[PDB]
Amino acid sequence: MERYENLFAQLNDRREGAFVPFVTLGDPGIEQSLKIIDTLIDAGADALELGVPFSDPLADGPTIQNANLRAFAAGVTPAQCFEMLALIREKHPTIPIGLLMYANLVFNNGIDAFYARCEQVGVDSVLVADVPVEESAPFRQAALRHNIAPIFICPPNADDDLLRQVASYGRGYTYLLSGALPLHHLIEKLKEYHAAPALQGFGISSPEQVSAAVRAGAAGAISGSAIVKIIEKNLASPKQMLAELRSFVSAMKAASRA
């Protein structure tokens, strides 16, 4: 539906980088999560990265792990997540919606049925976070068949071989994480290979990291856990939670004008 392409062209109009918050769907409840997402959008978030609750405790930090636990504790299921996605899309027809999920989600229903469901509710992109590039073909092909952008991660030490693969396979945006190479170097190479615009997603904790990413040439930044941390710290006061989310998104967008 051109949602990412239109966003990045309009961000070019505004001379801004994208700010894309991550939240877990259904954290800390279905309705609070919907209102958290409305607040992020109203405060200036350019796109959304939304997680279907998963479990990766060996690797995840306490923030993301606790969010997954809060959503499961609220009884959140993939079914409810897809209904939430549909509602978000209906209220916000133009905002790019990226799903972040883990491979076992597609076991119960099958790869094509999963991507068909994404297409039906209006998702724009899907990142299956735990599938190596060597095993990505069935996901990439199913995504394209259903008009979904498959998101590929560019790791910090990617050689030109891998950069060429990431640039060619992905659509929508490139999820950049940056024997690491210089940030500006990865960005330049991805542009040389006509990759989808790069969103720096590593360690985007606060305004300084957004500004650094845009100054290095990235198209924007993805905040992997900073929004979830504000949720966790304000669980007892939804009003203060929403106010802190607004000031945070505002400060992150200010950094995106750097």
Q: Which residues bind a copy of itself (CB under 8 A)?
A: 53-62, 64-66, 68-69, 72, 102-104, 106-108, 128-135, 138, 153, 155-157, 177, 179-180, 201, 224
Is residue 220 a contact residue for Cl ion (CB under 5 A)? no
The partner in contact with residue 1, picked from Cl ion, a copy of itself, none with C-beta cut-offs of 5 to 8 angstroms by kind, is: Cl ion
Question: Rounded distance, CA 256 to CA 155, Å?
Answer: 22
Helix extents (H) in 99-218? 111-121, 137-145, 160-169, 183-192, 207-215
Cα 149–Cα 150–Cα 156 angle in degrees, nearest 5:
125
- Residue 232 Cβ, how far from a copy of itself at the closest point, in Å? 9
Q: In this complex, which beta carbon is closest to a copy of itself, that of residue 64 or of residue 118?
A: 64
Least distance between a copy of itself and beta carbon 202 (Å): 9
The nearest distance, CB 125 to Cl ion, in angstroms, is 8
| Ramachandran assignment for 75, one of left (phi > 0), alpha (psi -120 to 50 degrees), beta (any other) | left
Residue 11 or 166: which CB sits closer to a copy of itself?
166
d(CA 115, CA 20): 22
Does 49 participate in catalysis according to the annotation? yes
Q: Name which of a copy of itself, Cl ion, none residue 180 binds, using a CB cut-off of 5 to 8 Å depending on partner kind.
A: a copy of itself
For 99, 105, 119, 243, 248, the CA distances from 85, given in Å and listed in that order, are: 9, 16, 11, 23, 23
Catalytic residues: 49, 60
